[PDB]
Structure formats: structure tokens, C-alpha cells
Design a protein around this ligand. Structure first.
Ligand SMILES: *[C@@H]1O[C@H](CO)[C@@H](O[C@@H]2O[C@H](CO)[C@@H](O)[C@H](O)[C@H]2NC(C)=O)[C@H](O)[C@H]1NC(C)=O
Ligand SMILES: *[C@@H]1O[C@H](CO)[C@@H](O[C@H]2O[C@H](CO)[C@@H](O)[C@H](O)[C@H]2NC(C)=O)[C@H](O)[C@H]1NC(C)=O
Ligand code: NAG
Ligand code: NAG
Lengths: 452, 450
């Protein structure tokens, strides 16, 4: 391990961690430097799996996964205090949170050119993962698992395909939460999700079925039909521009609008990460004129208050503690420019998953919180079914014993050989944030190869 | 008002109420005495509307609505303490909670014959309302509103049709929460609900679509295809017999996932209202009773201990003016639900009758995560009445202290009838979203846009 990267006295903690945790940079392609924050297992880190965690966006920080989802401690509303987390994934694994690609968070590159794409990001993360192993040679033999969320549903399988070609890396499996596996299956399932979760009504639903469907087949993905598009445009407005929380239908929207943007003092805050209805000829805000206007612009995840986390990370002492070059600009959970200039290239993760499944060496899990609308569970359940694999287990519910309010159904699980699809009932996009104990129980049975 | 009925000092409250409240019996057809518990409006009861509240079952107590939903105070887990409810419906109305029919809660009949049906129940309630007005003549000119939930989706509109005919009663409107307005519409929308909420899977969904549907319609109600029926029986099992809470999909089931036994008491939780057109299936048939064991019926995945423990307190009974000879209070009466005869299959005629006068304000409101009387079944039901659209479907709002203004659900308005959803609430809307429910109720009473 690089002694110079270790975190000695992390602010906001009243009692110091009982496990070692590091913060530094992993070098990647070109002039890239990816900020990592590694937290060792709280029990037997020496023999605990190395678990990579990636958040999505594209252009959003994995320190979101640490500080707000499943890190050993979570930032508090004061943006000053950190409280230990009883459901930390690092209780049983050495977790590496990587801010990728360059420009996201405290990550950067010498030329500061942040326009990128799917292929380059997977190679950058791959090269960074190589660097990690040269900085932590002691973990070269530890079972490695690649995990992530949302857009990492793209990041993870593309990175996994590179890793499988490296015999030095002990790739054992991968898990993706509410991941964007297929834009088509996601966009289509969402329109259905919306009607049946009561957002549309029969009139809208009726026109949609009339203008976008023929047979029991609906095309809510790349339909050009005039009135169909006029209807999908409203569906788009209702789902994400009306004040509803696209990450959790049943939760309030932090700083709720009735629009496609909002102002925060004098900063335009954009919250559309560009992954939904991309193929529809919809009318959208001119995100492209935003940089020319000269107004301050920031991208925040939808219905998410980034204050606590941003307030914590931007504290000089925290930056000092985390070994952050003073020259680096302020931390934001998502980088607007990175997202805006990002180039999506793959249409779906089918080939990657097929390639990983062919080896029959990897443990794969796709898990979705069932009240999320950004990457709804249906689109991902369809995805997994379309892989046409051998079924190992007929759909069934999975349980979690809660602080003795007895075992309760935590969701449903479909198992095939080497791949399982699973739902977390009552959870939104950020499953660990909504259902901490169940997310952990699911994480634990995955690592341990125990049935869910 | 019946002075002798006044609740003078109710046990459990650390501070006495600011409003007068009464507990007694309303006489109805035959040997029947229905226990009522009237709580006056906390503000200007003299001019406040009289609001009847009925729960369902059939065979369950309206005190459930009081003590656990929107009463002025609610029972705490200790089944001893009552805490005031800042979202109480009695903040703006003189609410009348009535235990019905006979045999439910503290209600009874001199002959103890509790087998009944829809027609007898509405007549019974009607005569009870007549008696309430005999006891509280001062409340005769006050606007009357009939509200209820669940099976009261049948109780309420059928009672309103009787009430509509009595000019001495000042009926102004009715409101039904997660009401069973139509067995067919409830069953068909529930299967869709099940799939789109992630309980089914496409392998089961395909089988359903293949055997129960024909030409972009499905019949998940009274379908005669044998494999379709085999699939529907599976859907019924997952929804109401797998560990999921049918009243709120995203909520745990009280007691967890395994027939609660309570030592000489088999607890059954099958009220009998979903998939009624599938082959006969009664959960109690599975009960193996010892000679001397009693069967108690409770709402599915609910714990009735706090309310029952409180209500069976000898002191509580006394302050509530309950005849000492009456049996123990239970939130539901198994025998009443067991002998109950459902006569109406749909409430279309009743609502059309009430809508024809264009004199009553009608509201059907559903919590969208409930699977017993899901919001879609009732949205469909209200759409099927084919009334004039006043308000095109839109979200309605609630200003939260912590959250600021948030979308509380969606509302679609027609002339004299509005359908409204409560986002994130289950079957028992006020229990789930107290502030939204009170907000809705207040806009309803005051004829204000939702
Ligand atoms: C529903 O309940 C009412 C009341 O018991 C039933 O009507 C009674 O039927 C009995 C037997 O036919 C008669 O002796 C009574 O005179 C009737 N009472 C009244 C007020 O009409 C009714 O038949 C029951 N069942 C149905 C299907 O309606
Ligand atoms: C993905 O992004 C990378 C970098 O932004 C692109 O890389 C290529 O860029 C130029 C055009 O080929 C060349 O001058 C670079 O040498 C080349 N770099 C590499 C590593 O190939 C790449 O073309 C992008 N891919 C797509 C499909 O747009
Ligand atoms: C966001 O977080 C900060 C600190 O946690 C808090 O002060 C603020 O009120 C929160 N909500 C909004 C809308 O800013
Ligand atoms: C039911 O509630 C009571 C009191 O509220 C509690 O003591 C009891 O343990 C609960 N039982 C179950 C099965 O939830």
C-alpha cells in the first residue's frame, strides 16, 4: 500500500476508523489521474474481496456511493459530520470508490480535456485498476468484483470485458444496481411503468397505444410518428419535469420544480443526465448554449440535494486529509461539461454480458430498486430475460430478517446459470440509501455465493 | 344531544379534550343497536358539517378509523396511551364513527343474529342515522357527508341512495377511500398492478396474456379458460398469501412472513373481497381448531393489539357507555364476515343515481400502493361512469414543513365526481399520509380545488 496515500485524520469523525483507508490517484491513459478512496474491509482485509464501486452519470462521482450510499460513514446534513454506517459494504470487503472519468470530482488530466466516450472510459478505468494493483500489490490475489450503479450499468460490463482478458486480475464477478443496460428496454418499460404507477391516466395512455403501438408492441424508443411523439413528450414532462422524483416515485423531490431546469441563487442547475428518450425526436432545452451564456451552470442528480456532500468535500482540511492537489477546482457531485460532451457508443450491454456469461467463470447480479423511474426494474428484468440463458431458479421472493419484526419479503429474484436479476422492494435508484440492511444482505449473499 | 352519552373523562389522554364527544348506540331495524362514537368539530361544531365515517370488512369496526386513521387522538403501541392527532378530520367536522353492522365491535342485536347483506346493512345504517338526528336534533340542518373506506365502497353509495330519499337529511356529498366499487374492475386492474409493480415476471405474465386475453382486452375476473384460471389463482396467492402486505406493497407485514395463533385463538386474515370469481377458496377451511379454540379475523398484515387492548379496558368501556354484558371488542367479527352476503357487484347504478341530481359532491380517493382496492380499478370505475370532464388529469399538492410543496398525488375531475390518488399511501390513506388525507378532506369539504 502507498503509505503516502493513507488518510490519517479524517475530519467530521469523532472517533477515528478501526480500519485503514487511503486516498490518492491512479494513473490512466493520456494525462489522466483518477481520484480513488479505498476503504479496507473491517474484518480480514487481507483476505477480503476487492470490490470496485463506480457511480454513474455519465459525469457523476463515486464518492456519492461512499458518503451517501454504502461507505463506512455517511455525511450528515451539516455537511460536517460523518456517522459510521452499520450496513457498510466495507464490513466484508475492501471497497475502492473510483471517481471516473477524468474531470469528475477531484479526478483530472493534465490537458484538462474532458470529452470522452464509453470505450475510452473502460480503458481508462482498466489502466487505473492496473495502477491500483501496482500500488496495492498485496491484493493482486484477492477475489475481485466490479460493481456500480446507474450509468455504471454501461461502465461495469465494458470494464469487465477488459478485465477478463487480464489473467493477473482475479475477476470473480460483477453487480450493477438500477443500471442502464439497454436504452430501448429502459425507455419502453418506463412509459408502461408510468401509466401503471398512476402518472398518466387512460386518455394519454390511450393515445400512446394508438399512435406508438401496433399489435401488443409499443415503440416508445425511436418512434417518429407525429402524435405519438407529442404524447411521449408529455410523458417525459410528467416523469421528470413536473416535480416528481424520477429516482423514487414515492419520495419528495429535494428542491422540486415544475420544469426542466432551476436556478440556485445565480447558477443554472441542470438535472437531466441525458440517458432517457435519447432516440426520440423530442424538444429539449438548449444545453449547448449554456456555456456561451457565461452563467454559472452545475449539474446535480435529479431531485438530489448535493449540499451536505459538497460542503464536506470542499473543506480545505478534508481536501488536505484526502491528499488532494490544492490546484484542483472545487468538487461537485456531477460534472456538467463531462456529461454534456460525453459520447454514448453502445446501444445495449447484451454482447458484453453474453461474452462474460460464455466463460461461465463469473458471478453476475443485476439488482433494481422497484420504485425508481430512471432505470426501472422492468427494463432491467426484460434485459436479463433477453439474454436467453438457462434458468436455474423460477422467480421467487427473497427475505430479510429485520430487527426482529420478523423476516420480510425484500424483493423478488430470477436466477439463471451465472446471472441473477433481483428487485429491492420499496427502493429507488440508490438502493443502498433507501434499503441499507437489504442492500447489505444482498451484497453479502452475492460475495458469498449464497442463494438470495 | 344525549347528555348521558357524553364521554366525560376518556382514559389514556394526559390532557382533556377541548371538544365534546359522545359514545352510545343508534337504534336500527329489529333487535339492533349500533355503537356510535361522535366527536364534535374542534372549531365551530355548531356550524360544522356532520360527517359519517364507516370502515369496511365486511365485518370490521369504524373505531379503526378513529383510533388508527383520522380520529382526534390515536392509540399508541402500548394500547394504553392516546396521543392527539394534528391531522384529525374532526378539526373541521363533527365526525360520527359508527360500528356496523350489528355484531361488529360494540354493536349488537338483542337476538344476536348477525347474518346480513348489503341491502339490510344500508337500511340498518339509514335507521341509525335517523336515530342520531333524534339524539342530536341540533345537527339536522348541518350539511351531511357520508364517507368511508374499503368495503364501505359498497356501504356508502347504497346508504346515500336511501339518504337521498329523505329530504330531512341535508346530504351534500360522499367520499370513498380505496373503495370496492367494482369486483370486476378491481380484479382486472390488480393483475396488471401485480405485473407492473414487479410481483409477477414475464413467464407468468405471458401465460396470463395467452390464456386470459383476446385482442387488447383481458378477462382476469370470471374467465373460464382453465389454464387462465390456474394462472389467476397464482396471481391471487402472490398478492394475498405470500407475505406481502396487500394494503401497502412497500410496507412490511405485521408479524413478518411465515395464521397468527394467540393460544386458543386462530387468527384468520381473509376478508373475502378479491378474486371472488375464481374457484371457491376459504383460508379458514385450513384451520385445525382444538375444541375450545376461537377463530378471530383480523385485517391482513395488521396488528390489532394496541386498539383492542385499549378498547377492552373496563374503564374505557365505562367511559364509552358500553353495556357490561357485551362481548369483547375485536376490530373485525369473523362470524359476521363469514355469513355476510354480497349482493351488489358494481356501484355504477348507485353513483349514476346520485349524479343525476347534480346535487351531491362526490370524491373517490385511492392510495396508489394499495393492492386490496388499487387506485387503477377505481380510476377505471370512475371513468366508466362517463361523466363530463371538468378538470383534465393533473397533480395535486401539499406543502410540507420539511419538504416544502410536494406532489401529493393526481386528480381528475368530472362534473360532481372527482377521482384522486394519494401518492405513496396504501389502503388506509389517513394512517399512511395523514397530512395529505386531511388536506384532501378539507378541500373536499370546502369545495376548493384539490
Ligand atoms: C337481504 O336481507 C333482507 C333482510 O333480511 C332480506 O329480506 C328479507 O327476506 C326475508 C326472507 O325472504 C323476509 O322474511 C323479510 O320480510 C325480508 N325483509 C325485508 C326488509 O325485505 C333479503 O331477502 C336478503 N337477501 C337478499 C338476497 O336480498
Ligand atoms: C473515444 O474517445 C477517444 C478520445 O477522445 C477517441 O480516440 C481517438 O481520437 C482521435 C481519432 O481517432 C485520434 O487522434 C486518437 O489517437 C484516438 N485515440 C485512441 C486511443 O484511439 C476515440 O476515437 C473515441 N471513439 C469514438 C467512437 O468516438
Ligand atoms: C440541502 O442540504 C443542506 C445541508 O444538509 C440544507 O441546509 C438544505 O436546507 C437542504 N435542502 C435544500 C433544498 O437546500
Ligand atoms: C402487535 O402490537 C403489540 C402492541 O402494539 C406488540 O406488543 C406485539 O408484539 C405486536 N405483535 C405483532 C405480531 O406484530
Amino acid at each position: 500500500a502507498p503509505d503516502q496515500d493513507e488518510i490519517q485524520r479524517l475530519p467530521g469523525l469523532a472517533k477515528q476508523p478501526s480500519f485503514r483507508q487511503y486516498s490518492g490517484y491512479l494513473k490512466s491513459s493520456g494525462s489522466k489521474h483518477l481520484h480513488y478512496w479505498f476503504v479496507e474491509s473491517q474484518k480480514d482485509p487481507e483476505n477480503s474481496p476487492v470490490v470496485l464501486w463506480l457511480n454513474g452519470g455519465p459525469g457523476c462521482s463515486s464518492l456519492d456511493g461512499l458518503l451517501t450510499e454504502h461507505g463506512p460513514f455517511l455525511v450528515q446534513p451539516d455537511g460536517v459530520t460523518l456517522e459510521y454506517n452499520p450496513y457498510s459494504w466495507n464490513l466484508i470487503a475492501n471497497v475502492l470508490y473510483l471517481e471516473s472519468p477524468a474531470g469528475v470530482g477531484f479526478s483530472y488530466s493534465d490537458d484538462k480535456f474532458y470529452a470522452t466516450n464509453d470505450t475510452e472510459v473502460a480503458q481508462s478505468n482498466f489502466e487505473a485498476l492496473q495502477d491500483f494493483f501496482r500500488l496495492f500489490p498485496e491484493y493482486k490475489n484477492n477475489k475481485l468484483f466490479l460493481t456500480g450503479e446507474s450509468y455504471a450499468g454501461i461502465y461495469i460490463p465494458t470494464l469487465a470485458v477488459l478485465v477478463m482478458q487480464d489473467p493477473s486480475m482475479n475477476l470473480q464477478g460483477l453487480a450493477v444496481g438500477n443500471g442502464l443496460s439497454s436504452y430501448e428496454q429502459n425507455d419502453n418499460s418506463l412509459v408502461y411503468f408510468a401509466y401503471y404507477h398512476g402518472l398518466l391516466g387512460n386518455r394519454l395512455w390511450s393515445s400512446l397505444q394508438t399512435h406508438c403501438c401496433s399489435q401488443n408492441k409499443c415503440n416508445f424508443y425511436d418512434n417518429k410518428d407525429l402524435e405519438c411523439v407529442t404524447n411521449l413528450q408529455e410523458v417525459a414532462r410528467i416523469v421528470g419535469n413536473s416535480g416528481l422524483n424520477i429516482y423514487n416515485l414515492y419520495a419528495p423531490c429535494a428542491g422540486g420544480v415544475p420544469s426542466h431546469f432551476r436556478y440556485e441563487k445565480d447558477t443554472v442547475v441542470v438535472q437531466d443526465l441525458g440517458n432517457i428518450f435519447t432516440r426520440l425526436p423530442l424538444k429539449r432545452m438548449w444545453h449547448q448554449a449554456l456555456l456561451r451564456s457565461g452563467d454559472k451552470v452545475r449539474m446535480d442528480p435529479p431531485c438530489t440535494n448535493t449540499t451536505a456532500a459538497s460542503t464536506y468535500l470542499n473543506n480545505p482540511y478534508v481536501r488536505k486529509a484526502l491528499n488532494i492537489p490544492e490546484q484542483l477546482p472545487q468538487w461537485d457531485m456531477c460534472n456538467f461539461l463531462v456529461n454534456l460532451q460525453y459520447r454514448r457508443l453502445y446501444r445495449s450491454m447484451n454482447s458484453q454480458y453474453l461474452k462474460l456469461l460464455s466463460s461461465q467463470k463469473y458471478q453476475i447480479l443485476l439488482y433494481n430498486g422497484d420504485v425508481d423511474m430512471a432505470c426501472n426494474f422492468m427494463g432491467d428484468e426484460w434485459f436479463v430475460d433477453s439474454l436467453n440463458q438457462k434458468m436455474e431458479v423460477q422467480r421467487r421472493p427473497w427475505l430479510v430478517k429485520y430487527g426482529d419484526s420478523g423476516e420480510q419479503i425484500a424483493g423478488f429474484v430470477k436466477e439463471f446459470s451465472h446471472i441473477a436479476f433481483l428487485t429491492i422492494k420499496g427502493a429507488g435508484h440508490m438502493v443502498p440509501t433507501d434499503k441499507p440492511l437489504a442492500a447489505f444482505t444482498m451484497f453479502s449473499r452475492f460475495l458469498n455465493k449464497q442463494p438470495y
